[PDB]
Every structure is written in structure tokens, then in C-alpha cells.
């Protein structure tokens, strides 16, 4: 292989630039040309595609977002859109693709592999919800964004002796909520993977202000519901000054943590390695602190777990 | 004067600990005892009041919030509550008070001055809306909190070529919005002090994506209305992927900037100075980069201004 | 067991407070009293020891440093000092210790175990150089402190087209330098575990400014030598504007990352678990993303490794 | 005037990009072309000069450093180099310059003004040492960088009960040291503008550990001397665990504070205003919180002051 393409799709995550940078530098190390495909899969159709040179990735490792941009491409799922896509690839003689992003995106990449264009998938999402990896690029950075906000809310909650409900992103996964709750010492944490009881939660909360906890923080993964809901249902059964904050899209942006930069660098180079190796339809990741890769289809079946032993601990440390 | 009290009321702001620390150290420098009154004016009634020693303020300069806590005291406005308050003061022989916080709080302090208890007011609020000062303690820190969030939203807005409406606090004042908009290069800024036109705003926004601005940031002071409102009214007349984020209470918390620490230190010591000087019913502040103090009643009349020359500039730099 | 003690010794690391908080809450969860021993082992001698209550650990999870303090105790290594230590323990009926900190500290804890006081060791150091764990509490936070400083130096190095040598801590281990070099995209990285050639480094550096790299960052673990030394030996063979910066003790302080909070919470609670279990002379940690514990003596022999596959990568991505 | 040029020289400072962005947008607002001159004055000689478009300044307001780069140009001081400079300007028909940076740089701009090329100077330096302005672009951001490092050192100094000497930049001015010392609650502050006594400093320091201050922070402007020097002379007369840290070039880099963005935006636009007005040989700034401009030569004579009333305060709050 002498020429490959690279793109980012799904929700952007911090560390995507560091991955792109890694795919480019690693390929050029091996005398392979790399083409930046812009706007996710929507670039395979518009043909917005450009050679990426060394100087192209020379000031991005520390930058949030993706310099290739990202976009939803239903067009590409159609046989028509798909072949417009393939035709643009052949046209530039691109032989393989590294796809960086969500689990929506791993489908486009197995499709292309079956049509002669080997693709390797790279997990980019703050949600930490891609199978085949303990960790996705942007998770760690998200966590730091969250705890930073929580730390600031604790200052005001404490000064005013108020209780706060904080909604975190995560889509359908409780990892952000679970790790950020733990890390911020939240009185309770609500996540899709583990049962909660709202009465047990009020209870823990009255028996905190009894003993003189004046303030509390409750963490709610957006995958369980709305913080503005939980906050009111709480104000009712305690008649107690409650505030809600919905952190929102800040969780997505920002210069990536050291953890995410290293992860993106390691996985991006890894991906190129397998492409240049005759492997296609694989995704890479980190499992048990070891770099692994997997047949994509084998593991799109497998369902996501948080570590329950970590949820228990959050209960034991909140009392 | 040999014994004074100090308290924080209204919304807490970062830098309040640094002010308290300054009031305590400055008084003790002058052989004056200081008493920490907890829970704002609500402590003058409960009598939750404690001598503050040097070691009391020895690890707070960098801490957000107020270690004296703060609370609303309608009780204290009543003649009854007020005299319970006065009685607790006499009881401990506290002769004067430094009051740190909002403009609600400057009233309690003029009241006490007329009843023989000289009080000096110190501007603590992130809103920057206290007359007698160009700047209030916590403003600068708020600004940094805001631009930090904006910087993170710009990463995702840019990657996805989306337009964002960001709601900032400020109560009734546009200073947060105005300074943060400018500082983040917002396409437009909505503030109570200056007229905006929503059509002029859509216009500036179509004539941006014409020339190929894929993304925009619009800043809305909460004193003009709801970002979830503006965001939808925008989605309608552009049919264009709009997102809203309501920053919320993070703007209130967090370790204070260097600017706020210095300001709080300078004003807190200044306040003690005037108390120990036979001045009462005064507030202090910084005007034209000079430390000043003012008869409170003379200037509770005066109405708040942003700098309009700074609003113009924001228009000229957004086009 | 109904009563245990906890202390921090060695160099302090961010996340030590979160570990202490976890040891306290986890033990109180199980109806076990906990005593805070201050000033490391020097507290077992002075008897500066205090019961720790729930409210004791109620505002520290996000705090850098150790609220129990830490100090070197040669005294304690002596039979005399040691038995003054033991006598204070019996005096308060403390039956076991959780020891949080460096590998110096694991010796004190095996000593106590042989003298009827079961001790469990917990890895607290930014150096990431404790055997039995892939990661030590404070490493991740150190990394972020480093990359943050690097990011700032890159700004000025880039603007002025200068080359910079940056010395990072790590004692005898290259993990900080290795991970932070990778994460910051350093042109080269000098670490004790892997050979470097200074001429190969000048070479990579001339062949960078040939192709128009105006600026470079070189990372030096303090365990290989002095940056002020490498910088000059570089200025000589290139006659090229070189700057050195020695990051220093900032790498030790600061509010811990989400990663370090979680790690410290998990390992702290884990430690209590084994103490309360009849296990002594063990240290815990995380290996292959799994919580593990080890006979201390078995593994004080084992020698530290960085991941060499990660050093290669840094070479491949710098060219 | 229809065509101007803009460049940055001297030490780079955070907020220089925001100033450049402001000069460009403000001129284009008025139908005036702007040319980016690269590498400071060294670009007037090499002719490395490029038209700057709107999209040129579209993603820099939040960026540290200068995208125009900066360099020392002794060549330009020579009549020869100077006229190669002028010839490149005429060649592109550039009629005026906005010069952003140090006080070295204000000389180049008065020179050009006398040779028919009106120039306006804009204060860009972290040192806050440019006459005609209370504040220079990058100062505020420097302060925050410093206090952030101090806050981290306090964590470890406190945990270990050590005393620390911290050297800060500032060249010949004590403003960084003075403001950051105040803001960090330093035990003492050494600055060129105010006398210190080393024995008075040891004294304050023994009478601190008498009363049980276990740790202290001393701040030294690099313009008074070396921290590694003060630290040793302190270790001698106290025999007390002393540590030195030289913050270094981190103080120069990093995304600018909200304060610096606003200042740079305001002064940048202001500069263009005067150029387009027939004013030349002027520099702008902020004095008594008011935007002002000054004949350059009139005020290169005037000598720099810190506010002494602010140094006193630091003495009074440290005791």
C-alpha cells in the first residue's frame, strides 16, 4: 500500500487532531501518501479531499476538535452515495482508510472493506462507549472538563448550603457520570447501567443534613433522564433549595489531556500499521492496558459495561 | 476601635476568601480583634459568630466561595430581627463591620451605621454591577470561566460547522456578556444596555456563511432573556442547525484569578482602614485605576453603565 | 480489627488527599475507627496522632498535597525510634496501618508487619516508579502539569523560532519525560531506560531546520542529567539560539486529575479491605487495568520498566 | 490611507494574536488593506510580507504567541538595512505600520515616522514595563501563569513544611513579582523598585516558624538576582530545608486571559484609528482606566514605577 485516506466522523472529541497527526506522521514515516477526507463520509461524496503533508499536522497535537471536520452522511449509506464515494477514492487511487470516531462510523468502514477498500477503525468519542476498548479518545479530557465544572459548583453550593443536580453527557453510557461522580465525591450518581432509587436518594440526603451536610452534589448521566426533572422531584420531597445545571457541549471541546494525546497517538499509528499489513475491517483499542485490534463485526454485537465494582465504591464513599 | 466584625452576603463570588483574609490580617496588624459572622446577616440573628485568628485565614487566599458562608436574611430587615442583630453585636462588643458582597448587602450596612455601628461595604459579585467601582471582586474570575467554556464550544462548533447561542449570567448587567463576547470573538452580543436587532443578527449571520463562516457564537446576557428562546427563533429564520448552552452556576465558583485576589486584598485592607478611621456608611472600590470610597447613600442612586465604546468595537470586529 | 491508622510519607503527590479520604470513609463504612498520623513516620514518634472523623475528609478529594503532611524519619529506622513508634500505636490501640506514598515508605510498613502491626502500602508518587503498579497516584496529574507548561513554551518557541530543552522531574524514572514528550510532540526525549545519542539528536535537528522546522522541543528526564548542560552542548554544535527551562516543583502540586482521584479512591478503599482481612505486608496497585496486591518483599526486588514500544513510537513521530 | 502593515517584535506575549486580529478587522472595516510583516523588523528586510485577509485572523483571538513571528533585527538599525526595509514598503505601497511589542520596538516605529512612514506603537510584553500604559498586553496572562504555579508549589511546600524561593520573570520590572506575590500571599517579595533587607527577611521567617508557620513562599523578580543565590544564603542562616524554583519561559506562553484579549482588541483597533487619522510617532495604552496615546519620544524618557502603596500592603499582609 502506497496511498491511504483518513477521516473523522460522529461527534468530535478532543484528541482527534492528535490521532490524525499520528496517522499522517506514521504513514509518511513508511513512505505512504495520506489524504485528508473532510466532513466525515460526506467528503467521500463531495470529493472534498486533499493530500496531507507533514506541515499539515505540525501544530495540532494540542488542539481540540478535528481539523478534518465531521458530518452526518445518510447519502453514503445509499448504494448511490456509496459508489460516488468509492469512485472518488479510485479516482485519487486511495487504497485504504483510517476512520476516526464513533461507533456509527465503524459501519462505513466494514462496508468499504467488503468492497475492496480495507479500513481500520479508531475509537474517537468522549462517551467511552465503543466496544473493543476500555477507553476512547476524548473520555479522559471530558472527565477533566466535568470535574473542573463540579469543583466550581461545589464552591457555590458550599457557600450557600444548597444541593445541586448536575447533568453530564454520555449518550447511553454512564462512564462520564460514574468516573466524574466518583472523582468529585458526589453524594449520589445516576447511570443507565445500575439501578437507583429516588427515595433511597432523598433518604441518603436527609440523613446527610441531619448530621450537618449543608450541601450535596448529585450526578445524572443524560442517558437516565433530565436533571431539571430530578431537581424538581427532589425540591418537592425535601422542600429544600435545589439547583440544576446542565453542563452541555463544553464536555466535547477543549485541548485534550495528556492521557488522550498519548492514547490518540498510540492508536492512530497502530491503525496505519494494520492497514499497511493487509488487515482490513478491524478496529483498534486498549484493553487491560494492552493495545489490541478486533474484527469489527465480531464485536459490534458485544454490549457496553461500566465497572460495577466502581459503582459500589461510589456508594460506600458517599454515605 | 478595638473590635470589628466581617461577613459576606448576596451571591458568593471568587475572591471573597481573599478579601476576608485581607480584612483579618490588616486589622490584626493594627491590634484590632476580628469576628467572623457566619451566614451573612442571618448570623447577626442566630449569633453564629466566632473570633477569627490569623491561622483562620491562612489557607484561603486561593479558594473560591466564602468560608463565612452567605444567606438571605429578611428577618434582619424587620425592626425585631434587626435589634436581635444589634444585641448580639453589643453582647460581643463588636464596634464596626466590614460587609463583603452585593448591593443588596450595602443597605444592611448603612442601617447599622445610623444605629451607632459604623459599617464599610466591599463589592463582592461576579456581575460587576455595583456602583462606586469599575470592577467588583469575582468579575475577572467569571470572565475567565466564561471564555474557557466558549473556547471549548468553539472547538465543537467549528468541527461541526454549527452556530451556538451561549447564555451567560450577569443578572441585570451586560458586563460579563460584553467582555466575554469581545474576548471570545463572538459574532454578536446581546446586552441590556445596548439595543440589538434580531433580524440584523440573522443578517450578519447569513452574510457570514455566504463568505464561508461555517460556525458562529452568539452571546446572551441572562438580563435580556433566554438562550433557548433566541436559539429557536434563529433556527426558524435560517433553518440552520442551532445549539444552545446555558453556562449556569459554574460562573460563580472556582479559585479566583490573580486580578480578583489582588483586588480583594486591596479593597479588604482599604475597608478596615476607613473603619479604624471614624468613617462609616462608606463603600470602597476602584475607579480610573484608583482606590476610592463613597458615601453609600449618595451612590445607590447612580445607575450602571457598560462602556459603549467597547460595544461598538465588538460590532466592528465581528462583521 | 476495630482501629487502624493512616499516614503519607515520601514526596507528596496530588491525589493523596483523595486516598486518605477513601481510607477513612471505607473504614467508617465498616465500623472501624481511623487515626490520622501526621508528618509521615515522624508522627509515630512525636505521637502527633488524631482520630479522623467523617467531616475530617469532607472537603479534600479535590485538593493537592497531603493534609496529614509528610516528613523524613531516620529516627524511625533506629530500633529506639521504632519502638517509640510502636509504643504510641499500642497506647492508642491502633492495630494496623495504611501507608500512602513512595517506595522508601514501603519499608516502614513491612517492618511494622513483622512486629505484629499489619500494614498495607499504597503507591503515592508523581514518578510512576513503584513496582507492583502500572500507575502511581499523582503521575497522571504530573503529566498534565508538564504538557500544560510545554504547550506554553511551544507558543514562545514557535513565535521566536527557538529550540528549547525542558527538564522534567521523575527521579530515576523516565515515565514523566516519556509520556509528556510523546504527548507534547517533542522532537526528542532523553530517558534513563533508553539509549540516546546527542549527535543523532543534533542531526535530527539540523535535518528539521533544513526542511523548515524553525523550533524544536527536547525533553530531558532529570534522571539522565541537567538541561542547562544539554542546552549548552547543543548551542555549541549548532550555534543556534537555545533556551533551557527547568520545570521544577510545580510538577508536585495542584488539584489532582480525574484519573488520579479515581485511582486514589480505588486503591485507598482496596487497602483498607485487605487490612480488615488479615492480610499484612502487602501493597496494592493497578496492573493490566486490574486491581492487584502483592507481598511487598517479593516485589521490592523487581526493577522498573517504561514501555519500550512507546519510546520507539516517539522516535517514529518526531522525524 | 489605503494600505498599512502590521508586525510584532521583542519578546512575544499572550494576546499578540488578539491585537493583530483587531488591527486587521478594524482596518478592513474601513476599507484599508493590511499586510502581515513576518519575523518582526527582519521581515522588512527579507521582504517576507503577505496581504492579510479576514480569514487570516479568524481563529487566533484565543491563541498564545504571535502568528507573524518575531525576531531581533540589528540589520534594520543600520542605514543600509533600514533602506532595504523602506524599499520593500514602497514596493508594496504600504503607507503606515502598527508595531506590536516591546519598548525596543518603539524605536523602529519613530524612525519610520521621520522617514515618511507613520507608525503607531502598541504595548506587547508580559513585563508590564512600557511607559504610557498602566498595563501591557500579556501582563495579566503572565500573572495568572505565575499564581497557578505558586498555588501548586504551596501544596507541596505545605505538605512538607518547606520554605520556597520562586524566581519570576519581569526583566527589569518588579510588577510580575509584586502582583503575583500579593496574589499568592507570599511571605516576602523582592523587587528592583523597593528596598529589601535579607536579614529582615530571615527575621520575619523565624518569627513565622516560632508561631508555627511551617512553610513560606518568597518571590524574587529576576531583576534583583538569582533565586538559587537567595535560597542558599537562606539555607545558611536558618539551616532550614529550602527549595528554589525558576519558573522560566512558561510565563511567556499560553492562551491569553480575558483581560489581555480585551486589552489587545481595544488597543489594536485604537492604533489603526490614529494611523488612519494622520497621527504618527505615537504609542497607545490604558491609563487611569482610559485609552490614551502619546508622542513616543516624549515618553521614552519617563521611568517605570510600580505602585508603592501596593508594596506596603504586601508587607502588612505577610507578617
UniProtKB/Swiss-Prot annotation, chains A, B, C, D:
Subcellular location per the Swiss-Prot or TrEMBL entry: Cytoplasm
Catalytic activity: beta-D-fructose 6-phosphate + ATP = beta-D-fructose 1,6-bisphosphate + ADP + H(+)
Chain sites annotated for binding ATP: 11, 72-73, 102-105
Listed EC numbers: 2.7.1.11
Cross-referenced Pfam families: PFK (PF00365)
Main location as per UniProt: cytoplasm
Keywords: Allosteric enzyme, ATP-binding, Cytoplasm, Glycolysis, Kinase, Magnesium, Metal-binding, Nucleotide-binding, Transferase
Residues annotated for substrate binding in this entry: 125-127, 162, 169-171, 222, 243, 249-252
Pathway recorded for this protein: Carbohydrate degradation; glycolysis; D-glyceraldehyde 3-phosphate and glycerone phosphate from D-glucose: step 3/4
Residue sites binding ADP per the record: 21-25, 154, 185-187, 211, 213-215
Class of enzymatic activity (EC top level): transferase
Cofactor(s) this protein cannot do without: Mg(2+)
Active-site feature positions: 127
Source superkingdom: Bacteria
Any GO CC annotation of this UniProt entry: 6-phosphofructokinase complex
GO terms of molecular function: 6-phosphofructokinase activity; ATP binding; fructose-6-phosphate binding; metal ion binding
Positions that bind Mg(2+): 103
Function text: Catalyzes the phosphorylation of D-fructose 6-phosphate to fructose 1,6-bisphosphate by ATP, the first committing step of glycolysis.
Subunit structure and binding partners: Homotetramer. Component of a possible RNA degradosome complex composed of rny, rnjA, rnjB, pnp, pfkA and eno (although rnjA and rnjB's presence is unclear). Specifically interacts with RNase Y (rny, PubMed:21803996) and enolase (eno, PubMed:22198292). Interacts with BrxC.
Membership in a protein family: Belongs to the phosphofructokinase type A (PFKA) family. ATP-dependent PFK group I subfamily. Prokaryotic clade 'B1' sub-subfamily.
HAMAP family in the record: Phosphofructokinase_I_B1
Database matches in PANTHER family: ATP-DEPENDENT 6-PHOSPHOFRUCTOKINASE, PHOSPHOFRUCTOKINASE
Protein name, UniProt field: ATP-dependent 6-phosphofructokinase
Species the sequence originates in: Bacillus subtilis (strain 168)
Gene name linked to the record: pfkA
Amino acid at each position: 500500500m502506497k496511498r491511504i485516506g483518513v477521516l473523522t466522523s460522529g461527534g468530535d472529541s478532543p484528541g482527534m487532531n492528535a490521532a490524525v497527526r499520528a496517522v499522517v506522521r506514521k504513514a509518511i514515516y513508511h513512505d505512504v501518501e495520506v489524504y485528508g477526507i473532510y466532513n466525515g463520509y460526506a467528503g467521500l461524496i463531495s470529493g472534498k479531499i486533499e493530500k496531507l503533508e507533514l506541515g499539515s499536522v505540525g501544530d495540532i497535537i494540542h488542539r481540540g476538535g478535528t481539523k478534518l471536520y465531521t458530518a452526518r452522511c445518510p447519502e453514503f449509506k445509499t448504494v448511490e452515495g456509496r459508489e460516488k464515494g468509492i469512485a472518488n477514492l479510485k479516482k485519487l487511487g486511495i487504497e485504504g482508510l483510517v476512520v476516526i470516531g464513533g461507533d456509527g462510523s465503524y459501519m462505513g468502514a466494514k462496508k468499504l472493506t467488503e468492497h475492496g477498500f480495507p479500513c481500520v477503525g479508531v475509537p474517537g468519542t468522549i462517551d467511552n462507549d465503543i466496544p473493543g476498548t476500555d477507553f476512547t479518545i476524548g473520555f479522559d479530557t471530558a472527565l477533566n472538563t466535568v470535574i473542573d465544572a463540579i469543583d466550581k459548583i461545589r464552591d457555590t453550593a458550599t457557600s450557600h448550603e444548597r444541593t445541586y443536580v448536575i447533568e453530564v453527557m454520555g449518550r447511553h453510557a454512564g462512564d462520564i457520570a460514574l468516573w466524574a461522580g466518583l472523582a468529585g465525591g458526589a453524594e449520589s450518581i445516576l447511570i443507565p447501567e445500575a439501578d437507583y432509587d429516588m427515595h433511597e436518594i432523598i433518604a441518603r440526603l436527609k440523613r446527610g443534613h441531619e448530621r450537618g451536610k449543608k450541601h450535596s452534589i448529585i450526578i445524572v448521566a443524560e442517558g437516565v433522564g433530565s436533571g431539571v426533572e430530578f431537581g424538581k422531584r427532589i425540591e418537592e420531597e425535601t422542600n429544600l433549595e435545589t439547583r440544576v445545571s446542565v453542563l452541555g457541549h463544553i464536555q466535547r471541546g477543549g485541548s485534550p489531556s495528556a492521557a488522550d494525546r498519548v492514547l490518540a497517538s498510540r492508536l492512530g499509528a497502530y491503525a496505519v500499521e494494520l492497514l499497511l499489513e493487509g488487515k482490513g475491517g478491524r478496529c483498534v483499542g486498549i484493553q487491560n492496558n494492552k493495545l489490541v485490534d478486533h474484527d469489527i463485526i465480531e464485536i459490534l454485537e458485544t454490549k457496553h459495561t461500566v465497572e460495577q465494582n466502581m459503582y459500589q465504591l461510589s456508594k460506600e464513599l458517599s454515605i
